[PDB]
Short mmCIF file of C-alpha atoms and ligand atoms in Angstrom, two decimals:
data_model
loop_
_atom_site.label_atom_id
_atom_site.label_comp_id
_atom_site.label_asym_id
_atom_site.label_seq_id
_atom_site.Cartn_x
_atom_site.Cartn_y
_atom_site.Cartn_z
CA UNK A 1 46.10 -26.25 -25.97
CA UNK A 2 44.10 -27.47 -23.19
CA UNK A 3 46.56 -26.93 -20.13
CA UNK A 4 46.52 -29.07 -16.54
CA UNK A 5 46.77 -27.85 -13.04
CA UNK A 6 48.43 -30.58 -10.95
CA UNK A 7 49.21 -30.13 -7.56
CA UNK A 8 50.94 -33.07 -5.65
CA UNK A 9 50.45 -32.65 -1.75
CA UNK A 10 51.41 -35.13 0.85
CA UNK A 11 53.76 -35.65 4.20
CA UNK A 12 57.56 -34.57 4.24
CA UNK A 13 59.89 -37.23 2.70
CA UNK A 14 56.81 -39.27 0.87
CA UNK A 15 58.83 -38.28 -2.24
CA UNK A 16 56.82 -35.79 -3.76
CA UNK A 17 59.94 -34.03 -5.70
CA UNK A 18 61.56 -37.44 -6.22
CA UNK A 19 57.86 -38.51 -8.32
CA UNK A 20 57.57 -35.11 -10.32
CA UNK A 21 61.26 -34.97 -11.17
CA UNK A 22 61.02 -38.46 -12.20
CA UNK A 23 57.63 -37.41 -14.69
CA UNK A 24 59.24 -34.60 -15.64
CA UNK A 25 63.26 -35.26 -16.24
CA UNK A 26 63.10 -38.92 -16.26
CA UNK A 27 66.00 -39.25 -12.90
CA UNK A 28 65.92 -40.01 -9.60
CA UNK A 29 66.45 -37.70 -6.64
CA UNK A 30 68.39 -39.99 -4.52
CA UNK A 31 69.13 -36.75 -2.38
CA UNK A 32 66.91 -35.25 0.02
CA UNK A 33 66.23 -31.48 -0.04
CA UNK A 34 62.92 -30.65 1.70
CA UNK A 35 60.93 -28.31 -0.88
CA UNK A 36 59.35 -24.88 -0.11
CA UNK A 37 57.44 -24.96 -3.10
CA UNK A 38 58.87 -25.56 -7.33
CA UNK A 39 56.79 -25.35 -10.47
CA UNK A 40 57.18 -27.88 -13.38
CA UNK A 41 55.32 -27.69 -17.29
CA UNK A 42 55.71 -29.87 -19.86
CA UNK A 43 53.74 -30.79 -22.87
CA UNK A 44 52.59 -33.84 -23.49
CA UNK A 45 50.36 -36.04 -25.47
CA UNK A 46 47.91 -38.22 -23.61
CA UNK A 47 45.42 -39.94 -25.09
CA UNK A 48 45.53 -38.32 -28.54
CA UNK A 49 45.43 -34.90 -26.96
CA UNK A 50 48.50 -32.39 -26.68
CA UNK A 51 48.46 -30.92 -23.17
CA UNK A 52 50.26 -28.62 -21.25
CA UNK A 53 50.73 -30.13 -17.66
CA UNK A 54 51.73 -27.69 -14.92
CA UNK A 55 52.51 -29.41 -11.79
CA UNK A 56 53.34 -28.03 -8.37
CA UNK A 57 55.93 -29.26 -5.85
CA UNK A 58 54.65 -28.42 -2.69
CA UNK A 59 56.19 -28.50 0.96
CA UNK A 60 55.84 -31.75 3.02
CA UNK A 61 57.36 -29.90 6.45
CA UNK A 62 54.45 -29.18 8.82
CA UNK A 63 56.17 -25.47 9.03
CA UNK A 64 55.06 -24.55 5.76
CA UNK A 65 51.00 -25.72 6.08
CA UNK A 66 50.01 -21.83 5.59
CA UNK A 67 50.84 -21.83 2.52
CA UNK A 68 48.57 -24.63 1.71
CA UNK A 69 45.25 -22.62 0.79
CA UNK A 70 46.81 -20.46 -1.96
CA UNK A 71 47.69 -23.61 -3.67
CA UNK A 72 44.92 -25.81 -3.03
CA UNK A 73 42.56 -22.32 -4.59
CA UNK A 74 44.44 -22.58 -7.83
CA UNK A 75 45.08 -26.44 -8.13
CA UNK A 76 42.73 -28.37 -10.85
CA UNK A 77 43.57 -32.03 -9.27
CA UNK A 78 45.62 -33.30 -6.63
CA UNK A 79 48.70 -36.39 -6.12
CA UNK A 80 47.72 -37.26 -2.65
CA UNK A 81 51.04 -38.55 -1.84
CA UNK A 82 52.05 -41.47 1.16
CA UNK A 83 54.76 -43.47 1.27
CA UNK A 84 54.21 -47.42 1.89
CA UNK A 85 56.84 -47.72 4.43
CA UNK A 86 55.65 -44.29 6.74
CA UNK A 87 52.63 -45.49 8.42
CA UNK A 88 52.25 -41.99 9.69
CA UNK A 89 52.17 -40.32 6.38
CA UNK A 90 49.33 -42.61 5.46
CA UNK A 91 47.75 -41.23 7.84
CA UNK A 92 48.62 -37.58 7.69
CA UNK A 93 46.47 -37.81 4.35
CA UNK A 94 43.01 -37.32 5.05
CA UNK A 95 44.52 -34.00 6.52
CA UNK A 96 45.30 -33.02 3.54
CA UNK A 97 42.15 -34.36 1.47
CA UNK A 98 40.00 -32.30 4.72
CA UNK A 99 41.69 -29.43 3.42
CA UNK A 100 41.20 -29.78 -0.19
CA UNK A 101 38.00 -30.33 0.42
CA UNK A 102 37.09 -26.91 2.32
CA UNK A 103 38.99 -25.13 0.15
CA UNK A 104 37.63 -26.58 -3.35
CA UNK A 105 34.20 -26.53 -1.22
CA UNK A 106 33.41 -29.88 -2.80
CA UNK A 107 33.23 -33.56 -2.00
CA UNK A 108 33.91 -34.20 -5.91
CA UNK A 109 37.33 -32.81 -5.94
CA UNK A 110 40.03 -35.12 -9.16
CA UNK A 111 41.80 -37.03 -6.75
CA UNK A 112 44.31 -39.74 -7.02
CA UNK A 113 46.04 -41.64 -4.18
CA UNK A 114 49.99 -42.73 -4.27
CA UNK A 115 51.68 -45.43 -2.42
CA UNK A 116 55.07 -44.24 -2.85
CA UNK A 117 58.11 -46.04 -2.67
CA UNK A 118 56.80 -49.33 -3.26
CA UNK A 119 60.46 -50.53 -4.49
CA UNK A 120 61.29 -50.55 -0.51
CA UNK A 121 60.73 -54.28 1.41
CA UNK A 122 59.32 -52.48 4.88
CA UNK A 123 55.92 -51.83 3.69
CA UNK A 124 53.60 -51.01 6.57
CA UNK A 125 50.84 -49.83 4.82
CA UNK A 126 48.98 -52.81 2.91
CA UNK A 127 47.66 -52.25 -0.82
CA UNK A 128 44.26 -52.90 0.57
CA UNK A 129 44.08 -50.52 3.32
CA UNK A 130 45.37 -47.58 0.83
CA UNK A 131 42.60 -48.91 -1.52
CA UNK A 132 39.42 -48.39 1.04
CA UNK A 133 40.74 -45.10 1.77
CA UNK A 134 40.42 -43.99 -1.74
CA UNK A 135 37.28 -45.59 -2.19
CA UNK A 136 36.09 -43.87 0.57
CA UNK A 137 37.15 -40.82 -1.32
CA UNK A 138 35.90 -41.60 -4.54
CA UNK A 139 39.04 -41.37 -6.14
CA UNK A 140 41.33 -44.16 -7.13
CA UNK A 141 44.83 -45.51 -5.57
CA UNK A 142 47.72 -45.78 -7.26
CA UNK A 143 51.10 -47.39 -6.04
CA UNK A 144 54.41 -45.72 -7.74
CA UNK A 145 58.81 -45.72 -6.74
CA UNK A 146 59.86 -42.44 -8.23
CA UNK A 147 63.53 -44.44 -7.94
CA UNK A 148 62.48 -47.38 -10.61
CA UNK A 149 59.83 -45.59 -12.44
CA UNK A 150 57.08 -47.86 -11.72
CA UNK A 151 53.70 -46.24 -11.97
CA UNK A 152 55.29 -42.79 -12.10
CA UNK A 153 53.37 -41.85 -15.41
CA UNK A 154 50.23 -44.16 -14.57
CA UNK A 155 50.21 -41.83 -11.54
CA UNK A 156 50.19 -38.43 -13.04
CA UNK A 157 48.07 -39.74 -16.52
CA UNK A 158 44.95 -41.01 -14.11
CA UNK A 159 45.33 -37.74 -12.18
CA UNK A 160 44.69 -35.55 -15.80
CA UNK A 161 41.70 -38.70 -17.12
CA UNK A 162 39.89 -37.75 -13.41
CA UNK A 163 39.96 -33.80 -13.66
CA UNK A 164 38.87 -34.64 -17.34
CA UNK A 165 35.73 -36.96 -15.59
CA UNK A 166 35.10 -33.25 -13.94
N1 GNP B 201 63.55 -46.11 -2.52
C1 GNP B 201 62.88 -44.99 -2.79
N2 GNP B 201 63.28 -43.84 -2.26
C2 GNP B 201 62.50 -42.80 -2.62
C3 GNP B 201 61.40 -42.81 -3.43
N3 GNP B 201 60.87 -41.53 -3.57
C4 GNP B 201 61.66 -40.78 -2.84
N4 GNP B 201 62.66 -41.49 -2.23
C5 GNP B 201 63.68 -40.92 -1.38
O1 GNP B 201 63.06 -40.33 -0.25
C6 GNP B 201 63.74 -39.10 0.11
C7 GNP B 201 62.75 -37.96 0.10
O2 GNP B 201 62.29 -37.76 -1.27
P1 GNP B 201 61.61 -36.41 -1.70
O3 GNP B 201 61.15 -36.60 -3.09
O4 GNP B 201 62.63 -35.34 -1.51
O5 GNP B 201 60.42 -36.24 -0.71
P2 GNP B 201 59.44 -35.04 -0.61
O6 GNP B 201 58.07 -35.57 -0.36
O7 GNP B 201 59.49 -34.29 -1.87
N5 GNP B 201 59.99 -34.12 0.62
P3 GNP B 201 59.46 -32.64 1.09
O8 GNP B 201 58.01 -32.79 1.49
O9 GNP B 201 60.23 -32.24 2.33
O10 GNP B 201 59.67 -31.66 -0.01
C8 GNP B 201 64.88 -38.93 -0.90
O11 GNP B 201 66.10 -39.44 -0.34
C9 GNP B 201 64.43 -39.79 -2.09
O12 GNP B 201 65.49 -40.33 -2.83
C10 GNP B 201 60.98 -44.05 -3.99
O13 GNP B 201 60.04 -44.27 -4.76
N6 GNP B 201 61.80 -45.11 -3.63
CA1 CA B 202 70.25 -39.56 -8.93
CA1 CA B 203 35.70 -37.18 -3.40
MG1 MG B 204 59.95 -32.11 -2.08
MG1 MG B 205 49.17 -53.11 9.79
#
């Protein structure tokens, strides 16, 4: 079966684990436990086909950045993750898509871009800002809370329909 490489990248604390557990084992990390870097598969069927999605964790914490080539080589599409009341991460994201793109060599890298967190009330990063960043990249933007479930799938299903635009 045709098989998935999802790799979701973003700032520490955005909720990257929180997001993929949620896809993956349908609960919600309320704890936080800063990630090195987990693996997750599960098959699933979207849109009529039987997949295999294999989705990496990856490490927020600035200490780890070395290990962001080796997983950015291998990745297939990336879950650009912020959260909507971290200002900062927003920001921290274009170092991350920079990245991606020297790595993949390519401005036509499957993208998507998550608002995370957008169950929380002190939202400092507006839906329309996140939306002309994407645009900018080409890629589309997504809003998601790991903790309610809202646009948790959505998320990770446009993430496999862009690498499948690819
Ligand atoms: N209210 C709310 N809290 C969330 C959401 N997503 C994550 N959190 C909380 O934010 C904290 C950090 O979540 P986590 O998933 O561990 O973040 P991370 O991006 O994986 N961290 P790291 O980069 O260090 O591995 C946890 O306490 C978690 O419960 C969300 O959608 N809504
Ligand atoms: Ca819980
Ligand atoms: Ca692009
Ligand atoms: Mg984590
Ligand atoms: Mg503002």
């Amino acid at each position: 079966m045709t098989e998935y490489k999802l790799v979701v990248v973003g700032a520490g604390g955005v909720g990257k684990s929180a997001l993929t557990i949620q896809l993956i084992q349908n609960h919600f990390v309320d704890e936080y436990d800063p990630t090195i870097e987990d693996s997750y598969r599960k098959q699933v069927v979207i849109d009529g086909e039987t997949c295999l999605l294999d989705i990496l964790d990856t490490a927020g914490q600035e200490e780890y950045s070395a290990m962001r080539d080796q997983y950015m080589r291998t990745g297939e599409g990336f879950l650009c993750v912020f959260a909507i009341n971290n200002t900062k991460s927003f920001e921290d994201i274009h170092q991350y898509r920079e990245q991606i793109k020297r790595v993949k060599d390519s401005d036509d890298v499957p993208m998507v871009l998550v608002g995370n967190k957008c169950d929380l009330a002190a939202r400092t990063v507006e839906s329309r800002q996140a939306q002309d960043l994407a645009r900018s990249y080409g890629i589309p933007y997504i809003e998601t809370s790991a903790k309610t479930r809202q646009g948790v799938e959505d998320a990770f299903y446009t993430l496999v329909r862009e690498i499948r635009q690819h």
